[PDB]
Amino acid sequence: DLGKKLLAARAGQDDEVRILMANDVNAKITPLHLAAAYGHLEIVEVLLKHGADVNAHDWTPLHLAAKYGHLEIVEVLLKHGADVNNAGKTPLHLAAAHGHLEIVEVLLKADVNDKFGKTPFDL
């Protein structure tokens, strides 16, 4: 049952994560959702190196990271074929509702035009 011990990535125990991968990176929720949400760059990087789903669905890693404010993580997620655009909400929403200028700027090069007809600009 190495899967339970893997989702390690939640607490960011990189040595354990690496000692686990060397012995299912797509176990289910995902390890990548976790690492990206809590903000553990090295973890998400090694995970991707092990062939982890970038567009995995719970919610995406990119959306989570765009919500909790993890810039570098977003920059390594979007640079790996991630959907730049749930409850209707896309990353540009979670970012532009939590005051993330850096995130919104970097992600803008994402459409600006929710299920309530709410654009990120209205948030």
Partner: protein
């Protein structure tokens, strides 16, 4: 009103006087100021004294039990400070006699911590409840890791078999 255990999966040293300790410990208790751990109890154990408990502040733990019913029917909220295995506000393991139902019809709030139900060859309806509705608004990313007659028509998420509904 207030009362616990922090021994975890520690096999009981006393053994022969276990139910008595737990009994005098939890009777009349309405708020458990710590952890509620139920472990290493035979098929004949009573556990009636639990019908008063309506709030645990730490974690919950029901492991290695040949009992079938755990009358935690008053337990409305589990705070979720002291987390079992660092992320489980409720853990139920190796019950199998054997645990057949975790009658927690009053449970509607888990502030912090995930859920862990494993190795219960007699437990039922534990996969009928929507733990995401119980999970607090901020406890969204909690871990849920979960092998019997359908629940009541009047419910259809269920904890028991009677009209025992969520």
């Amino acid at each position: 009103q207030v009362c616990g255990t922090d021994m975890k999966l520690r096999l009981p040293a006393s053994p022969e006087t276990h139910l008595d300790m737990l009994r005098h410990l939890y009777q009349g208790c309405q708020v458990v100021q710590g952890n509620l751990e139920l472990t290493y109890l035979p098929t004949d154990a009573s556990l009636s004294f639990l019908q008063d408990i309506q709030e645990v502040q730490g974690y919950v733990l029901i492991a290695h039990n040949q009992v079938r019913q755990v009358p935690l029917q008053r337990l409305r909220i589990v705070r979720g400070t002291q987390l079992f295995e660092d992320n489980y506000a409720l853990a139920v393991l190796d019950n199998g006699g054997g645990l057949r139902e975790l009658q927690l019809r009053s449970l509607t709030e888990i502030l912090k911590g995930g859920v862990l139900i494993q190795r219960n060859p007699q437990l039922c309806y534990q996969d009928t409840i929507l733990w995401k509705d119980i999970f607090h608004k901020n406890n969204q990313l909690a871990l849920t890791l979960i092998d019997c007659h359908p629940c009541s028509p009047m419910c259809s998420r269920c904890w028991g078999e009677s009209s025992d509904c969520q």
